[PDB]
Amino acid sequence: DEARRQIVSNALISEIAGIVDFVAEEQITVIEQGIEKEITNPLYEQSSGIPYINRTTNKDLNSTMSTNASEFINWGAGTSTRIFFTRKYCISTGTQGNYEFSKDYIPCEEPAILSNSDLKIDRIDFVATDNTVGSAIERVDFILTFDFSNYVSSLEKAAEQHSISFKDIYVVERNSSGAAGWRLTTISGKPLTFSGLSKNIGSLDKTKNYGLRLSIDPNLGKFLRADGRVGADKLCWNIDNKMSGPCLAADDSGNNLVLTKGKGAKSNEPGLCWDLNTGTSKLCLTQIEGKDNNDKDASLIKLKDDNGNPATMLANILVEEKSMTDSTKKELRTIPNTIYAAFSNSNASDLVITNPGNYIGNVTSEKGRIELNVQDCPVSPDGNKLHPRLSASIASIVADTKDSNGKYQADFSSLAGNRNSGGQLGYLSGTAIQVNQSGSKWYITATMGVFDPLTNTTYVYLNPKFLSVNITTWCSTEPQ
Amino acid sequence: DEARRQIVSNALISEIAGIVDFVAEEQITVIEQGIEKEITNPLYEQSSGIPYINRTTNKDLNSTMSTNASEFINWGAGTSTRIFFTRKYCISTGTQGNYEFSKDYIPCEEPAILSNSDLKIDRIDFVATDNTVGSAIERVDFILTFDFSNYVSSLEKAAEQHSISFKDIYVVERNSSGAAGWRLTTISGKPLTFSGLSKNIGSLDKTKNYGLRLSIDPNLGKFLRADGRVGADKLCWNIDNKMSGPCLAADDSGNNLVLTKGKGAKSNEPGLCWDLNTGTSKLCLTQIEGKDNNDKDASLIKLKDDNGNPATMLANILVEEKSMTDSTKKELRTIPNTIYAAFSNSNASDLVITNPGNYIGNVTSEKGRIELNVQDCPVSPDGNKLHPRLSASIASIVADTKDSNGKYQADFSSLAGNRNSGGQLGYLSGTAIQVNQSGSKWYITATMGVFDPLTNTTYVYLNPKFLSVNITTWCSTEPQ
Amino acid sequence: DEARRQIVSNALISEIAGIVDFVAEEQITVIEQGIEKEITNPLYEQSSGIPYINRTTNKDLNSTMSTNASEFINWGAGTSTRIFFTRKYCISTGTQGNYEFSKDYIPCEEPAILSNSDLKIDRIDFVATDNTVGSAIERVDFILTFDFSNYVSSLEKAAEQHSISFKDIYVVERNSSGAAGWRLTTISGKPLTFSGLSKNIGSLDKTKNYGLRLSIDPNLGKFLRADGRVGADKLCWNIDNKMSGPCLAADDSGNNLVLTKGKGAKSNEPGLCWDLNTGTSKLCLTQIEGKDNNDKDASLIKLKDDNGNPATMLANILVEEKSMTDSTKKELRTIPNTIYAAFSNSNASDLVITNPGNYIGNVTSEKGRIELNVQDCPVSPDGNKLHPRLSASIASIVADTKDSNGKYQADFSSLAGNRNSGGQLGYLSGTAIQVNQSGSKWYITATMGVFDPLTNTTYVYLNPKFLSVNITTWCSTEPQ
Amino acid sequence: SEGGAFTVNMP
Amino acid sequence: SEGGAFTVNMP
Amino acid sequence: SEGGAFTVNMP
């Protein structure tokens, strides 16, 4: 069953991956007296003790594996090794380890799947690059005891998923069950690598106890990697085979990437550009020189094509400014919309309000009204509730009266033709324009006073086709 | 002469490098007629044929070179090999190859100098990493026949210029002129490299046919590359020698790069920044926490300086929102402009419309009109035609009449002085304000009715200077 | 003093780093008669002279150091060597050198501290990769004479701070004070590395003159480097272990990075994205197809979530367009704000202007006025002074008169209740609305004419509560 | 909600 | 195109 | 700066 093998290999590679992470940190983030502190990894202090200083020297993958217990590191059951690679306070009391890492490299308790599995990490070798105490480790070999190509496929899959790869896989053997008895399995004096285990499986006696030695190369080499595990101090782009293009580097915050000019730029105007490569100009977001409201030196961003003409961005925009009434307070608003509209009462029955002093209206159901759906306000920063807003301004207004047939002729329903219907005008008293809202609708209503000097009769009109307004809608922190 | 040898070597390394480039691409970009397609390289399809699957097994540089024609790849004259490593349509009609590569790895016609030069590529060995069909290639051997230290200097110079390197150069010999008769030249049973032909030049009989074996290697896709031919799973930046800065990674779509916070960020506010380093703040585009119109968790982008103050972007802005009438439809709009303007008729001759009931004007030629150029709308997403829009709202309006000198004193041409000339007011009937457009011009005209109670005379005014409007101009998907 | 040793090492590494940087540039930017031009580094011209063609041949770090003066390069006092590695015009007249480099690799005048320090660069070896004139250099060795573990610590710190690392450090000795007498210090025939000077210090006689040979490798090509000293032609991201994600590459300008679609993208809509990973959609700035005002093919940018809905950007926006009056001139504007407000004179004492023909207002101190703070305008590009603007449009107006109690009932202070008090209306003469400003304030005032037909009395009102306006505020290059 | 008219005067 | 005036009244 | 009023008529 390979589904069980896959769990064992995922745990094994999880353990292997954590250990490599620990080796690959020369400075580790530790927790001394409640405040994170960076200290040198105990691996590279020539003052730390067993097992942090333990080193083997078989730099060659084909050299004889060590038989010294203070050179390799015995792992697993019966060993207190795990204490030295887990937090001091994996128990509430504190273990015998002296370090509280800011992060768990491996779980404090070994994965339960590995407690009785057929493949276990039995011993870990730290290959030293030189002969100084606390030297750098240039290869980590993991001896996994078998309690053979099925697991290698499974382990290779699990390592593929964890962004690690084996330098090589060797078959290792020992005559007993001691951690220092491990030697390389040999075919004619040549150590048997796993890739060559297909042809040499027959010349191996069942009298030995076998396992695999997985060799990794911890050092996260100074070069940027496909797995992205290299932090870049900066990165610059080439132009015509020279390092004269823009550069990206992080600022101190950890949140921001900063784009700066290259050495080849004759002008200092860095930009990010999008290109469809479909025959039109790329669009660039470029930083350019400016001046503030007090004529001091400043800068801004411009979205432009390759001709220097502004480009178009589709988005919701919020603008923040101090309230022009009370300063020291911020106000947010969106880009407004304008709709031209006139009211729609046309005949005398709907137009004339019979008893003005007594009339009590219902702007939700009055004839001739303007009705709109309440817009949805866009995203706003935390703690700034945006309210939908609406207002109306007078666009055209006349005091039209009944003609010889009791009909009203002045009509402003279409802006391109307001003067083409003239009407028979009286004296204007003015108009009262009101804006109300329910949960879903904006309601706009109006009242106009007119004196007819022909009949000396006073009329009050409701939502007339003689009055048209320009309606402005937006969202704002300033309520309605 | 080293000048001709250099030309020949330049061609040889061109061929060598091109072939190496093809091997090093497991996924190749091919042209299935009208469109680029990613396909598995025929080298690594266990379903491809001769010569795509041919592999030698001499992993060791000192091992026996293959003598099987279905293992090595015979090259040059007498072979149909080149067809399978060049574009299918190098002739307009088509060759026997089955692939239309998007790029020429090697020129379709072999460099004219190599047809009769003294050093020729006779055979290519693709060293397999295992014993599976379509396995990965770990070394490429180029057997160059001599038709020996003069040419190695030239080949090393040409390869220096091409960003490739020889793993080693070996001396090979054959008793006749067969492509499979190549074997390693030996001195006392030890294969003769090129770093040992100086001292062993004497023990070689001229009865053999000699050549050089330049060995290259394809997979150089472990560390990100200066030429950018290796993709990154992610990239993170450093701060103070720690991997605590922002990170960039692609999403699943293939279109987007995503910026995320680094481990050192105490706040989760990733940003892209521009900096001129001219003594002023960098400008950052930062993602911050927010809330939508239903108070649900959301986010937005903020363009800010280093003090947390909003910054400025010069661009055209489109806003999208549901139509406040039909809802089921989306509408686009631009940021409007506002113009204060008054009409410009001043005297009674131009002001008074003599016979209003019969009067029909020409708004494109009426005196005192407001005339503006029709704006150009910005780029809009496909299928969203933007229309120029204009509206006018009344800013000031009075029913002025002739004074004792027949002049009109009220004047609203300047907003800061609308009240300074009062005039002689009658009773206002209202105004009809009309906006028309040709292909190039906006025409804004207006008609005002006034009753003079001193003379009991009725007036109709055209484009009066005592009527002023605030003109709003913008672009929108909603027509005029 | 390790403080004095550190300054010597910083100078030493500065010289070393500059020299290595020059060695690492086969194409150098030179200046020939006013203009920068690219020429081949004289190191790799087989036509250049001493010392550009000088090469040693000890490829092995353990091989015999050359003793030929036309192979190594003598450095320092008594040598004209420095001339050939600094600009021709480090002196105003011109030196004997033949090249004016566009940049100083090492300072023209040697760091004054190196003129008499205990450690000096005595000789520089250019290890050749082959036996051609002007061949590539594969290692640069700096022989430092002592005029031994203290300074190695300091030099390694200085090289750490200067983004270089030593390939290896050897101990060298000479019997006298000649630059050609340098040979490798040996213990039992084995060249003494510095990592083995701890155990063998006693077997070294004080009769020799000793020094250190620092070996630096030349290039950092092909693979991008963590300290960012390697430029990228482009960089593409991976998706599912394939190079199918977006790509960034510099355009020709040196200012722009360009984002393009990946090979795996089924749509051509490249985007830059922010992600908080806090449960909401990432925000993307994506380029999409569009059409201009002439319906020609174009593009724009869209700020959208993963659902294709517009997102929100908080920033100041400037829009640029041609003046709708005088073409050929460009004008800037900001996103406006709208404020609904009414004037506030309510009682007869404040409302009625007794003798209108004689009244001279003080718009700064009149009762009932609308007063606002003059807004601050955002950043604008150089030479475009923005002026604050304010305008008013009529929202509601009625010709109210005294009621039976001498009170005025119509009140438009709240838009949602404009119709709630009808009042007792006369005939309207109109209104004059004026906007003025001091250094800090907007002053909005108004005058309304009313005829009371019940009393045949003429009224002029100042800042009445029955007049309301929509106040529009913005910034523009068009003045007030 | 509510909307109302207004009284006007007679000579 | 067009523009038109309007008729007003007489007491 | 300044502000001003306007004159209306008596019947």
Walkthrough of the structure:
The complex is a heterohexamer, with three copies of chain A (480 residues) and three copies of chain D (11 residues). With 480 residues, chain A is mainly beta. Chain A folds into three domains: 231 residues, no CATH class; 85 residues, no CATH class; 164 residues, no CATH class. Chain A is built from three helices and 30 strands. In chain A, the strands form nine sheets. In chain A, strands 3-4-5-10-6-7 form a six-stranded antiparallel β-sheet, with helices on one face. In chain A, strands 22, 27, 28 and 29 form a four-stranded antiparallel β-sheet that branches. Chain A starts with a helix and ends with a strand. The relative contact order of chain A is 0.09. Chain D is an all-beta fold and 11 residues long. Chain D is built from no helices and one strand. Classes of the chains: A mainly beta (480), D mainly beta (11). Chains B and C meet through helix 2, strand 12, strand 13, strand 15 and strand 16 of B and strand 11, strand 12, strand 13, strand 15 and strand 16 of C. Chains D, E, F: This is CofJ. Chains A, B, C: InterPro entries: CofB-like_b-rpt_dom, CofB-like_pilin_dom, CofB_C, N_methyl_site. Chains A, B, C: It holds the Pfam family CofB_C. Chains A, B, C: It comes from Escherichia coli.
